[PDB]
Amino acid sequence: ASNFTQFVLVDNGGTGDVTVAPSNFANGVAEWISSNSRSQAYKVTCSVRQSSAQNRKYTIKVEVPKVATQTVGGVELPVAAWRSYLNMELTIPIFATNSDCELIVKAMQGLLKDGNPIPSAIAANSGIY
Amino acid sequence: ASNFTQFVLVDNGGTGDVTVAPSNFANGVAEWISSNSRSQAYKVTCSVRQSSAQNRKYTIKVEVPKVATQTVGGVELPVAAWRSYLNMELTIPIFATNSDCELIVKAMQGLLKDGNPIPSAIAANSGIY
Amino acid sequence: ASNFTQFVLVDNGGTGDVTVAPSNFANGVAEWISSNSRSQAYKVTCSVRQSSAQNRKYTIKVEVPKVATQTVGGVELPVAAWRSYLNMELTIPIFATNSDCELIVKAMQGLLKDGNPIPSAIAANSGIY
Amino acid sequence: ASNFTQFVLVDNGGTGDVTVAPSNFANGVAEWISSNSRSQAYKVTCSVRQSSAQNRKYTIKVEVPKVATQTVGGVELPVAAWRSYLNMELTIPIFATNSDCELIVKAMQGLLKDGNPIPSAIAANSGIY
Amino acid sequence: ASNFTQFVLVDNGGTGDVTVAPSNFANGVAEWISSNSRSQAYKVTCSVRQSSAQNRKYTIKVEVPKVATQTVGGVELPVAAWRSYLNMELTIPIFATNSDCELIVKAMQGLLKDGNPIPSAIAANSGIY
Amino acid sequence: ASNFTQFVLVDNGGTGDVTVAPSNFANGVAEWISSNSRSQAYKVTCSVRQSSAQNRKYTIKVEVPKVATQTVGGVELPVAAWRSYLNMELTIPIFATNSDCELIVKAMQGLLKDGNPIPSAIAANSGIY
RNA sequence: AUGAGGAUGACCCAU
RNA sequence: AUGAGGAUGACCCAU
RNA sequence: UGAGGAUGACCCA
RNA sequence: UGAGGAUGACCCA
């Protein structure tokens, strides 16, 4: 089941959706980027490895561009001022079955669901209170 | 207001749903745990820090346990066979507006949506190909 | 949600009630103080820590002041003639479920219920006999 | 007259109530134990001493056991899987009158009354937040 | 009386008012920010501590954005050129009663009232003369 | 003009109003005191300095006294039981226009307005919760 | 320069 | 600060 | 650990 | 004294 296909990263109900597509596969690290310059693109990378004898580990990185007052195709410096970096590390014991793993995916989905604490804090430039 | 509220971490259609509640805010680290013995509980922690002069960093951690009943010293104890750990760090520039942050939240949601590449690989115990 | 709120420490019918309110939550130590002169105020502090691999430990402290006025050089100040110090430590293994914890709390409330041995000895400047 | 009597430590309606009864009063230390196996019993001890010239100090201790059966070599014994330990010290100046003492007792009962911050945190395996 | 609620920081008679709302409570330090990027937001933080045996101390910090020629949602450097920092430290002796403290609040209100020397000097980019 | 004028520091409706007047400008520090013995007077000081190449810093200090009559050496002297100290530093960039500065003054006024969070906490001898 | 550093208060301390 | 560094998990390691 | 003291988030064996 | 540990009337600084 080849899963290295393009998908919708940011969904705005069909209109203004951000699609990210396969762009690199060097070293088993899969990469997806949006149709932009690499300085203003949405980037996603993913890889898996046996971190130790007892665990496997997925490393997922996401890069999101600052859009407000952005100049499409322009040179915007400093780079650090225009990009956000998401860095995810998922450690799963080798005993985890397919079912166990489905549960783990759901926990991640639940964590970021709309209206829940964490995503609400992030979207409002806040912390917890 | 107050975003420090309980929420559903694992959704199984209102039955066997893993719901998590606020349990501690000591040292600026917001904590949530499920109704279980501290040894078998799901745990979620969050904290925001001004990592740099121009950055803010969210550090989020989730612990998914595999519940079991061990028999140490010929006695039964509620324990965890093993634990899966999710570790994410999100660095956001201070110049990001609320709408810029909403864009990051949506990207994270789209990333883990059912059927998309990454959650599919994780749930099937495989890599991206 | 939040339990770091104001509450009635001493209940005297509805009036003369001593209420203690949040004042500080620095370094994992929550603190409650009663209104007016800090010098004549009631104080309550609380904290929890993983005392060891299997134990979590609560450290609770209460201070009951003896309100008085100090005159010196014809200058009077609101002070506490003296203070009574309550100091308790509660150790709970990580295997304790919410039910086990509820039982522990009932034990503490029973220990101090009116008419029982200990609260009666204390209330009468006495010991056991 | 005597306050070294039996009393209800844990109140569960009228049945399932945990009663603790006198067992020993050696060396100024009063001790109460619940019926049946000493190994699975609840324990409460109390003592008072002149800690200094101006202070008298009460030292109270409670033990809540986790009842369980231990099997070894096919030989089972009634034991406590683990124990929760309550430990409190109350210091009271010799100037405190019976009224002052009654106030101190109300403070302790208020601190642990249902719904209040501390008994709620404990009952839920939580801290303050 | 939960006082950690939103309030109007800059009042322009209903039209164009700047409201600041709860955004963080890490370490007992309360934080309020306006609905902006954190680089252009109005920020307010407050905390209290026992500075010494004789005093308590409120530390209040306010950050005000430079608005003239501002680009909403834009990246404006250097940060020091676009922000003003207010740093307040209020030391109150433990003997101060609620009344004493009300007087202290009034002194602060009087200090900054319209038409008075200090606020007039500040609003006109002047000193005293 | 000349903004160095007397003003009402504490307003109690034209009766018992603490009014403060110009008393010294030595060393670039504007001083105001109330009509009292220098030992029992309210004191307000202000000074502006070009703290940096691109900053100006206002340093404001207010002293609220608790008046009393001490009897040193068997003689009566007008003195202060204790003093409360307000210490504020305001750093404003040189690029701030007059309208930018008016915005800072309004923020400080809104901050201390009756009924708002901070002045409420201070007047009640509590923290923010 | 920075400190939710301290003060008796136009001073002191740490970096 | 950086690591498709590790973990028993608000900790540890390398640079 | 302490039926160790305390001017109580400190101190002693 | 200790928001020091405990197999809780013991033990550590």
XYZ file of N, CA, C and O in Angstrom, chain E residues 110-111 114-121 127-129, chain F residues 1-9 19-25 30-33 44:
136
model
N -3.913 58.583 41.983
C -3.708 60.019 41.994
C -2.464 60.424 41.234
O -2.449 61.423 40.524
N -1.409 59.643 41.389
C -0.156 59.906 40.708
C -0.330 60.012 39.191
O 0.217 60.909 38.556
N -5.171 62.286 34.984
C -5.016 63.273 33.917
C -4.792 64.682 34.415
O -5.471 65.136 35.337
N -3.848 65.381 33.787
C -3.571 66.751 34.172
C -2.481 66.896 35.210
O -1.922 67.986 35.371
N -2.179 65.816 35.927
C -1.136 65.878 36.932
C 0.230 65.884 36.258
O 0.386 65.419 35.134
N 1.243 66.420 36.943
C 2.612 66.515 36.433
C 3.196 65.308 35.700
O 3.500 65.398 34.519
N 3.360 64.185 36.397
C 3.959 62.993 35.797
C 3.316 62.517 34.496
O 3.989 62.407 33.475
N 2.007 62.219 34.503
C 1.460 61.768 33.227
C 1.545 62.808 32.118
O 1.660 62.460 30.948
N 1.509 64.084 32.482
C 1.590 65.154 31.494
C 2.975 65.226 30.895
O 3.130 65.485 29.711
N 3.987 64.998 31.722
C 5.362 65.024 31.259
C 5.578 63.872 30.282
O 6.109 64.059 29.192
N 10.278 66.168 30.487
C 10.747 65.848 31.815
C 10.040 66.883 32.664
O 8.999 67.405 32.256
N 10.582 67.195 33.832
C 9.959 68.200 34.680
C 10.681 69.527 34.457
O 11.891 69.552 34.229
N 9.938 70.627 34.507
C 10.522 71.950 34.300
C 9.599 73.045 34.838
O 10.083 74.190 34.965
N 3.814 78.119 31.166
C 3.834 76.673 31.556
C 4.856 76.364 32.676
O 5.481 77.267 33.270
N 5.009 75.066 32.930
C 5.887 74.496 33.946
C 4.975 73.430 34.484
O 3.878 73.737 34.955
N 5.397 72.179 34.379
C 4.571 71.100 34.857
C 4.916 70.784 36.300
O 4.276 69.935 36.919
N 5.918 71.478 36.838
C 6.335 71.249 38.214
C 5.387 71.980 39.156
O 5.713 73.035 39.700
N 4.209 71.401 39.346
C 3.181 71.982 40.200
C 2.681 70.988 41.234
O 2.937 69.791 41.131
N 1.964 71.488 42.238
C 1.432 70.609 43.264
C 0.220 69.883 42.713
O -0.397 70.333 41.751
N -0.117 68.752 43.315
C -1.261 67.982 42.873
C -1.773 67.103 43.997
O -1.107 66.932 45.012
N -2.973 66.567 43.817
C -3.585 65.707 44.818
C -3.150 64.265 44.609
O -3.541 63.630 43.631
N -2.341 63.755 45.533
C -1.854 62.386 45.448
C -2.943 61.416 45.887
O -3.223 60.440 45.194
N -2.491 66.157 49.522
C -1.995 66.969 48.426
C -0.472 67.085 48.599
O 0.040 67.206 49.710
N 0.242 67.020 47.485
C 1.696 67.044 47.485
C 2.231 68.236 46.675
O 1.689 68.563 45.622
N 3.290 68.883 47.164
C 3.850 70.061 46.492
C 5.337 69.986 46.156
O 6.096 69.259 46.798
N 5.772 70.751 45.136
C 7.172 70.785 44.702
C 8.068 71.172 45.865
O 7.794 72.144 46.562
N 9.142 70.428 46.083
C 10.019 70.752 47.194
C 11.510 70.748 46.880
O 12.304 71.258 47.663
N 11.906 70.190 45.747
C 13.320 70.160 45.428
C 13.559 69.663 44.015
O 12.833 68.807 43.522
N 14.582 70.201 43.361
C 14.909 69.785 42.003
C 16.414 69.601 41.879
O 16.964 69.628 40.782
N 13.225 65.661 40.442
C 12.115 66.478 40.889
C 11.512 65.792 42.111
O 11.281 64.583 42.097
N 11.274 66.565 43.165
C 10.714 66.036 44.396
C 9.463 66.781 44.817
O 9.343 67.978 44.610
N 8.537 66.049 45.416
C 7.269 66.584 45.902
C 7.067 65.977 47.280
O 7.334 64.793 47.464
N 6.603 66.762 48.244
C 6.325 66.218 49.574
C 5.032 66.843 50.076
O 4.578 67.851 49.541
N 7.244 61.992 46.611
C 7.170 61.556 45.223
C 8.373 62.126 44.491
O 8.640 63.312 44.584
